[PDB]
Amino acid sequence: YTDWKSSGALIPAIYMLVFLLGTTGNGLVLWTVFRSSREKRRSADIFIASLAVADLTFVVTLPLWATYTYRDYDWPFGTFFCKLSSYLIFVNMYASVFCLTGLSFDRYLAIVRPVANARLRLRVSGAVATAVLWVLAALLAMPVMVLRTTGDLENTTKVQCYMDYSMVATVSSEWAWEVGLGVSSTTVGFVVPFTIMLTCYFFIAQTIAGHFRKERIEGLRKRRRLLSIIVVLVVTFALCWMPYHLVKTLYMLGSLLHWPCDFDLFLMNIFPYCTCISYVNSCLNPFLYAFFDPRFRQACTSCTTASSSLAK
Amino acid sequence: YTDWKSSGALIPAIYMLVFLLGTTGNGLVLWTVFRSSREKRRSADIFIASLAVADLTFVVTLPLWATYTYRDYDWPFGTFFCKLSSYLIFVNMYASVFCLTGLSFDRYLAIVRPVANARLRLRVSGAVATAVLWVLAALLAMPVMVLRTTGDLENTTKVQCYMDYSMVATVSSEWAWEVGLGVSSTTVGFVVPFTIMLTCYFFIAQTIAGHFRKERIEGLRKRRRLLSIIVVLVVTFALCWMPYHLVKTLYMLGSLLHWPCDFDLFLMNIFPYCTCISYVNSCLNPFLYAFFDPRFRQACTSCTTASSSLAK
Amino acid sequence: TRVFKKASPNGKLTVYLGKRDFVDHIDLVEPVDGVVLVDPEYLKERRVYVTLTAAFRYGREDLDVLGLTFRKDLFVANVQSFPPAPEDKKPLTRLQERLIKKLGEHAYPFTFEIPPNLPSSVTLQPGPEDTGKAIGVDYEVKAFVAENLEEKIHKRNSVRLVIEKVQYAPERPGPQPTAETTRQFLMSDKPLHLEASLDKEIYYHGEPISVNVHVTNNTNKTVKKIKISVRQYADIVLFNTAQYKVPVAMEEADDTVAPSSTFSKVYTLTPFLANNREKRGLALDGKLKHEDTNLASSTLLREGANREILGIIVSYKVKVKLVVSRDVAVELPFTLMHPKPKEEPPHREVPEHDIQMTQSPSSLSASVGDRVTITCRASQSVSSAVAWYQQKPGKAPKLLIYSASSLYSGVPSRFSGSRSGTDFTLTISSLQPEDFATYYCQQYKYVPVTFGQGTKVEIKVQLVESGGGLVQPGGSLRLSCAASGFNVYSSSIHWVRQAPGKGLEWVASISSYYGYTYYADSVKGRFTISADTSKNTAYLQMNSLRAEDTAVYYCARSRQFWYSGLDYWGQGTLVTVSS
Amino acid sequence: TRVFKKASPNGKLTVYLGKRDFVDHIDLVEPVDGVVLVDPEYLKERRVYVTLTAAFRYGREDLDVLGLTFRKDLFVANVQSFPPAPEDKKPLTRLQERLIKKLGEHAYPFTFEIPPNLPSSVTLQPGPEDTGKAIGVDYEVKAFVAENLEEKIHKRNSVRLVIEKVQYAPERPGPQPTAETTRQFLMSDKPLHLEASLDKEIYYHGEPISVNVHVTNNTNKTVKKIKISVRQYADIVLFNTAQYKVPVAMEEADDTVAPSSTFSKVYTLTPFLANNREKRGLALDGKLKHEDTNLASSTLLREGANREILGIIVSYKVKVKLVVSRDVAVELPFTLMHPKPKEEPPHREVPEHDIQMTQSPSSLSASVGDRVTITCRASQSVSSAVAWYQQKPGKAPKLLIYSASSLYSGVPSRFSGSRSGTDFTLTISSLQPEDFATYYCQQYKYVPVTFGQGTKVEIKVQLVESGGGLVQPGGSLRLSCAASGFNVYSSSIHWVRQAPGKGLEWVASISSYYGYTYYADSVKGRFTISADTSKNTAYLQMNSLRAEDTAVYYCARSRQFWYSGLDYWGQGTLVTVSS
Ligand SMILES: COc1cccc(OC)c1-n1c(NS(=O)(=O)[C@@H](C)[C@@H](O)c2ncc(C)cn2)nnc1-c1cccc(C)n1
Ligand SMILES: COc1cccc(OC)c1-n1c(NS(=O)(=O)[C@@H](C)[C@@H](O)c2ncc(C)cn2)nnc1-c1cccc(C)n1
Ligand SMILES: CC(C)CCC[C@@H](C)[C@H]1CC[C@H]2[C@@H]3CC=C4C[C@@H](O)CC[C@]4(C)[C@H]3CC[C@]12C
Ligand SMILES: CC(C)CCC[C@@H](C)[C@H]1CC[C@H]2[C@@H]3CC=C4C[C@@H](O)CC[C@]4(C)[C@H]3CC[C@]12C
């Protein structure tokens, strides 16, 4: 396909910029989590810690792909590192969305339904949630580790790291496997987690509005601010993760929908911009989830009853 | 030249075993340090932490070289990873020996000359020593990074990672730069640090022998155990870092010594064995330094003056 | 008698309140009566409003996202104390005019009325590590001074008093509950019929619940274990009406009900806090601030008038289950709460985690008919928590009075107590022959319980103790006092000693319900105390005995709930520890 | 007159020592005399060995590594108590015989002799955060019971009482130091000649040192700064005979000494602990256990017969340095330590971080020939730390007796004090005509300083307290106490008040040497006090005035070291806080 001349030079620079911003911000947030270490606040601090780890490891393997795009798509490193970098990228994609969804669910449980939040053992349930979250992310990204290799064709001899679905009866299933794995990923990493997060946040918005129904003139301003943070969180998630999954599903649909190949060219050369848009949320998250929660900011920065006489 | 058939199969086995043992032990010791870290307000725990990091990173890059030896000496990874793995290996070698020497000097200052130990700011001096230790290790290993590269299809396409001393210095300095870099590396990473460690421990031994002269039975046995542990430390350093540097300097002297050229090939085949012997230090380092100190073991699991009347 | 007082940071605003705990009935509650001082010179144009902040906190701590305080308002009634607008004209309570007689006109009154249907003060258990604030409903009388109500509250010009609302057991009895559910297994020749029941419907905290379970196991399939569970239906109607639960009393017998058999058994389950000290979300009765209190008391909603009472509605029910080898369960409702206590309960850990008395001279000489006031200079303020004991020499002590107040039941009127400052006194009019006996003044406010120095006049259903036979001047002795007619969880079995030919001394104490033990420094860790629900027994294991340990030892029994002095003492045991 | 007592946990092994400290004069020291109670039954056949544990701890913490405790014995001598050694035959000191006169013969005695040359008790300043045990030389009389020396010691059967050794300044004066170091420059014709000297050789802690730097500058090279440094030569002669140093005081005067100049101006430098609290390694006079103790006292050797004294000798120097703009420095040795105190110093923070007094007479008639037993009760123990004072009509308070027994110089002999329990008394046998005044009793043990209630019988050098005038009914007012004739670091200054026609009441206090301040509860944080050395003046800022602040304020001085009540009283000003 006719890859854009502009893309080859644009993608590496923004990739480096995202690497720097995301890695330094996630370093700062994990530094906060380590330095505080009071075992005092943020009963669900482990969710933000897991999200920070996922985000940092999501941007850490980025420079290899920055070179890949700067190397005119010629992977220099080994087959093992193509496998590991892709597996880390996908595990971290899934764990980032999962941690965002689980944190939204924790906030929902601890706001709209605070009775159960106070009742139940929060810390152990959160720890088990993180454990199963990471195990499920690893098991969901396992296929992109077992089905990824290097070296395709062409007298250029340019080593290309790609998902070679041809390992499993390629002639019997090539588009079948492409569409199946793509749909499974985009429907068990985005559609389900995203709808869970959106419903949690919708109920949260309703109940915060109800709680600040009257309060006071200051109170309704705080309601405005809280609704603002909710909208900005959900909409930054939306803006970041819609281009990627949208073009990905459009491409998977073009297989059985005789997409206009000419416009399929456009889809192909717009996808990398969608992946950096996905990375935008990874870069920006530490400046919202930690910044707007001033626990991180602080970490970085009457008388008495009496008796007398009942003289008859 | 003939690489031993036994070596090809054997070397990766010891390499992987060292990887497992050293990585697990260093992870455990760092875990212990982090369990408490700041709260105990320790003084020289920074040196143990730096040494644990040094050993861990020493073994972390090792499996790449394990596959290098299993791949009939084919480095499949990139030039960047040859550079980075070699640089990490050498930085960690130097930082391990340096942290052992600094720990020895700290113990000497805190035993033989305890008055100054109480006097000075142990925290500030220790932190500055750690910072300069790491910076100096990085600067000592910079030349290997700037002179490590990959290539040499050698009519077999067997891509190899090696020092290309011809990279900077002209052909006029062909053996000259090999000699300079090897001699400098030894004389500023082992000879000087080892001399400091040995003299510090000799003074420590003399002073403990004098100090424990009193008492009886139990005290003499405790002194004997202390001398035994000092001997174990220095001799487990010698048995491990003697073969490496010794064969290195012997092959070095072969430039102007024209060896029988069969003992020379013997040296060539044993050098990797000396490398794993050197790694024995990092492997066993936790089970000695953390084991002996009771703090790690703990982490793992009256009247009062009165006045009266002087009746005259 | 006395009256409850609270101050303010200024100290000018002093709030006088009567009985802190209020009784709510199925129709109407007791009106709140109180008074507050006022300073017109400081009160240039402000106004002292007092209000009944009856609010439900349903969020741990607060401001989880910096501005979210999860504390709904279930009721607030505001009234200005001064000048009282001539709109209510509600005649003052005798208590209020009494406070005027004590303070004066500057002590302006206020009377509050609560709606018939509102939650009873209950607080959910924070848990082993929750700290913060307890999720639950709570009442607080708050008085603050301001020219207008909308003005911001003031740190100095404000007073908060945590009032509590409680429901006591109705005077009448109730019908014994029944529960019958018939379940058919694969075999249905005679479908299994559950015939469980309960002795009585109204119980007090501690009285053993005798779950009577009877069934005919006609069907072939057998049951391994019978699970009996006095469970707390906490109906937390806060936004999302729910019925969160947690079992308080748990019992897993081994009664394997074999088939073609009729099983019948009565099991004694006493719901007490200690055995469930960690089950987060347990509803306990009203806390003033942080003290330990009994489990939540059953609330009596208006029959057939379920207004969907917001907050926590606590009911208790015995779940009886038969576990088939390869689970037939039913429920029984019961109402659990205190009786109507004549003494308004003191909402502290009555013997809260030193003091000494000085009783009048032992040579008080008086003949028949000669009235005498036997005085006692106390060390500190026991707050009318003193009992006088007619210690008749050679025989067990006898309780004369509780709390320096009306006499213990059956004690004739000849006795009478006078409490004044940090010293008390008991008077007697006519000295009947029985009055030729030794007297003692006793304080029960601070561990150790501290008695008087004794006074002997000069005229001129059981407690069994096992152990004796003076022995072991440094060994160890096990003295077991058992009370045939006192529920172990319904009382604290005290352990006191009188030194050989000397005064009485408190040594040890057990609080079964709360499951906590109290010891004396005079024996400190040397003496161990314990009691078992086996046969109403309390073992006392003295260790490393001494000649100084020579004494005469008595056990006793004190009402576990609202500990009111000592009302039963044991036969005693002269143990002059020797070889 | 009291005497020091210590005992074992058993309570029978009771060590009695005459006085905790001793003077190691050049020839010898005072022998350590003491006694110990004994029980041959409890001491079946084990004997009480008493030893002088003169040790030197030279490693921080307790056990840096297992089996490595960094202590060396510099002296130990042992005596067997019961029966006394038949060979000792050493006549008892008076104090031991008096102890027998009050205790039993079971109080076996013991006398110890120290060698002429041994280190003086000194401890190195641990630091802001060092914890462990401060390393230094320390003596501790230890008495432990065993059948043989090698037999195991018992934690309970052992008494460990820290004894301090000190060297007080020699009675006579000595030769003042000098310094003459000559350095040449470009114009080497007249090389710089240094003539810095010092006022005196003997100083007490606090007495400002007037460093007299006289230098003749004619070489063109000028020096920018002048550095005067009172530095602590800590001659640690243990193992490595080092000379670790720390600068106690560092005056930095910007005397840009230029060619053709002669600056002889004396500059004052007063060493004190406050502005050196963090300089790890600063030697300080021996602590009992942890009490804040002043700097190390200059130890005196025997004309240089340095037997490599295996201890922390300390000697103080005054270094004067001149730093060339494009560094000529010299030393001046001097000896710093306390005078000989008639009362044995109280080795504690005398006003250690409530105690109220009561006086009976108030107004009791007595003409000439009547001894007035002006008695007093104290809330708790004051330990002979009360000073008697009288107020002649309309005049300032005057100190009659100090130490509760001692006699302030000049004061006549008619006064006499008597301790008894927690109560004291004063008497005047022959009422000298000037006996018409009211008397108090100023306890000085625990802050706040609480005096007597005044007792006016019936007859039938300067202090400048400036800033009077009844103004400011709620503002902040500054009062200046200029106590010319008393170094601020040499005396703690006190602020008290007397209510109209009432007794005296303490308000505030500042101890400059330790650089720390004390305030009264009655004024808590409302009042501020701070002393500046420049004018040797204490400014008291009473903030947020009140009508309660209407009283007469008085200033007082107290010997900074071994605080002995109040020895000087100011004019006093009647302040009526008002418009
Ligand atoms: C450009 O993308 C990559 C570039 C380099 C490495 C990659 O992976 C590790 C990814 N990549 C991949 N590759 S791909 O699977 O071969 C993908 C190219 C293929 O399927 C496909 N062709 C066309 C369309 C329209 C859709 N899809 N899929 N996702 C990611 C990814 C990576 C990072 C972040 C995110 C959100 N996504
Ligand atoms: C066999 O060794 C290596 C194998 C693989 C990677 C290596 O490096 C990262 C090293 N290696 C190197 N390579 S080398 O420098 O090319 C070295 C091979 C060359 O010079 C030389 N050939 C023969 C002789 C006789 C002397 N000298 N030098 N040191 C280390 C090293 C590594 C680990 C641990 C230690 C103590 N040492
Ligand atoms: C391009 C090709 C030839 C490179 C091949 C490199 C392979 C052999 C190397 C790269 C990194 C290695 C892995 C790194 C870490 C682990 C985790 C440990 O629990 C088991 C070994 C295992 C799983 C290693 C096995 C060997 C390994 C997979
Ligand atoms: C065989 C050849 C083609 C491999 C080339 C890979 C090189 C160009 C890649 C691989 C890893 C990359 C580096 C990874 C991390 C960093 C640290 C950062 O602070 C600056 C960029 C820098 C230094 C990257 C620059 C580019 C890089 C050096």
Side-chain angles (χ1 to χ4, degrees), chain A residues 114-115 119 306-307 310 312, chain C residues 1-2 5 58 94 244 280:
Chain A
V115 280
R119 266 198 39 68
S307 69
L310 206 167
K312 184 167 326 305
Chain C
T1 68
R2 317 171 93 206
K5 186 179 308 214
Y58 54 72
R94 167 254 197 200
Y244 303 87
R280 284 153 188 293

Side-chain angles (χ1 to χ4, degrees), chain C residues 118-128 131-132 134-139 141-151 153-154 157-170 173-185 187-189 191-199 202-216 218-229 231-237 239-254 256-262 264 266-278 280-287 289-341:
Chain C
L118 273 194
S120 61
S121 188
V122 292
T123 84
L124 293 166
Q125 169 158 126
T131 314
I135 172 170
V137 185
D138 189 61
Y139 293 5
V141 160
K142 188 158 187 60
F144 80 103
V145 192
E147 303 203 354
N148 226 340
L149 192 64
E150 311 93 342
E151 302 185 0
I153 293 298
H154 321 117
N157 324 299
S158 48
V159 69
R160 60 207 133 184
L161 168 49
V162 181
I163 51 152
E164 267 71 10
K165 164 176 176 314
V166 317
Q167 302 194 350
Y168 293 149
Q176 70 285 0
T178 51
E180 325 293 303
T181 176
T182 292
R183 158 65 194 286
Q184 63 254 10
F185 298 130
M187 165 49 53
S188 64
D189 61 298
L192 199 38
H193 166 25
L194 190 40
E195 325 155 67
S197 167
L198 256 175
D199 158 78
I202 186 44
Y203 285 160
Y204 316 95
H205 290 272
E207 159 133 20
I209 274 147
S210 44
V211 180
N212 167 24
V213 167
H214 168 43
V215 173
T216 66
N218 263 322
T219 303
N220 308 1
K221 295 180 182 297
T222 311
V223 302
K224 341 195 317 187
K225 24 177 186 177
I226 200 164
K227 183 243 221 184
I228 275 48
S229 34
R231 294 181 328 131
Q232 180 156 228
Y233 275 1
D235 189 353
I236 298 88
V237 173
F239 288 154
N240 50 302
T241 173
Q243 200 167 131
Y244 303 87
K245 289 156 298 324
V246 48
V248 165
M250 186 61 37
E251 194 275 290
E252 301 337 328
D254 89 11
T256 69
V257 195
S260 183
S261 71
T262 67
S264 58
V266 286
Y267 307 158
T268 36
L269 177 63
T270 278
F272 58 96
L273 177 58
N275 161 77
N276 317 86
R277 201 103 181 177
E278 81 306 340
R280 284 153 188 293
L282 201 54
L284 312 190
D285 273 23
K287 317 287 217 169
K289 300 94 163 199
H290 272 30
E291 73 289 19
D292 308 284
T293 201
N294 51 94
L295 306 153
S297 35
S298 298
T299 314
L300 318 151
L301 300 209
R302 184 72 211 81
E303 305 286 291
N306 191 64
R307 172 258 203 188
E308 201 64 7
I309 329 306
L310 288 89
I312 325 302
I313 311 151
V314 191
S315 59
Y316 283 21
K317 305 183 51 49
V318 161
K319 168 170 174 183
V320 56
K321 177 159 53 52
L322 285 300
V323 186
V324 160
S325 53
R326 318 308 278 148
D327 319 295
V328 192
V330 84
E331 292 316 90
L332 277 75
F334 59 109
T335 67
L336 156 56
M337 63 205 167
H338 307 241
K340 266 206 72 55

Side-chain angles (χ1 to χ4, degrees), chain D residues 432-433 436-455 457-485 488-520 523-525 527-544:
Chain D
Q432 284 125 38
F436 209 33
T438 206
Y439 300 68
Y440 321 86
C441 48
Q442 333 198 295
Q443 80 91 21
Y444 44 95
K445 178 46 154 42
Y446 273 91
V447 51
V449 197
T450 74
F451 334 111
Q453 308 328 92
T455 83
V457 179
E458 287 60 65
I459 212 80
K460 290 82 131 177
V461 284
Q462 61 272 89
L463 276 152
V464 162
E465 323 186 14
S466 279
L470 92 170
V471 152
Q472 278 160 0
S476 73
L477 184 50
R478 192 188 91 145
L479 272 286
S480 43
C481 197
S484 67
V488 286
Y489 291 108
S490 74
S491 295
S492 301
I493 212 76
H494 283 337
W495 270 126
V496 316
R497 65 191 141 90
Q498 185 192 12
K502 307 299 182 62
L504 322 183
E505 166 53 24
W506 172 75
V507 175
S509 162
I510 188 155
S511 304
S512 313
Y513 196 104
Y514 280 95
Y516 83 131
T517 279
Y518 271 12
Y519 291 116
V523 285
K524 188 45 55 56
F527 281 33
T528 286
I529 190 180
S530 167
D532 72 338
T533 89
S534 64
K535 310 320 302 160
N536 286 359
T537 302
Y539 317 104
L540 158 53
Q541 310 264 10
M542 61 215 68
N543 329 295
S544 306

Side-chain angles (χ1 to χ4, degrees), chain B residues 115-166 168-184 186-213 215 219-222 224-225 227-276:
Chain B
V115 282
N117 200 70
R119 285 279 287 97
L120 74 80
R121 292 131 297 206
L122 294 164
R123 203 61 29 79
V124 160
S125 175
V128 152
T130 278
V132 71
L133 167 147
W134 282 106
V135 169
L136 161 73
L139 263 286
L140 285 169
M142 162 295 288
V144 82
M145 160 155 128
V146 165
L147 301 187
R148 268 273 212 211
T149 175
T150 299
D152 265 12
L153 79 170
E154 306 297 3
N155 298 63
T156 60
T157 45
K158 261 196 193 165
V159 55
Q160 277 165 300
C161 164
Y162 56 53
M163 270 66 88
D164 162 52
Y165 301 124
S166 295
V168 178
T170 58
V171 167
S172 166
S173 88
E174 32 185 5
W175 289 318
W177 254 227
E178 210 138 328
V179 165
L181 287 174
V183 155
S184 171
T186 282
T187 198
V188 199
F190 176 82
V191 183
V192 172
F194 175 70
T195 297
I196 300 309
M197 186 183 202
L198 189 62
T199 192
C200 291
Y201 271 25
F202 171 66
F203 283 18
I204 285 201
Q206 188 164 48
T207 283
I208 171 53
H211 158 293
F212 229 146
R213 177 51 55 111
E215 220 199 323
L220 287 95
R221 304 293 78 67
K222 301 303 129 294
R224 146 173 302 267
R225 165 272 321 281
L227 283 319
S228 168
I229 187 174
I230 276 282
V231 165
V232 159
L233 284 164
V234 164
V235 177
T236 200
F237 182 98
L239 152 66
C240 64
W241 293 107
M242 201 46 38
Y244 164 85
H245 276 277
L246 172 53
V247 304
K248 159 69 131 53
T249 300
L250 284 178
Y251 173 97
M252 163 76 78
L253 181 60
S255 93
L256 321 184
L257 189 47
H258 73 285
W259 286 49
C261 298
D262 312 50
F263 216 83
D264 208 319
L265 82 92
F266 144 83
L267 295 174
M268 218 78 103
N269 331 93
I270 77 197
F271 187 11
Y273 292 135
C274 294
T275 285
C276 37

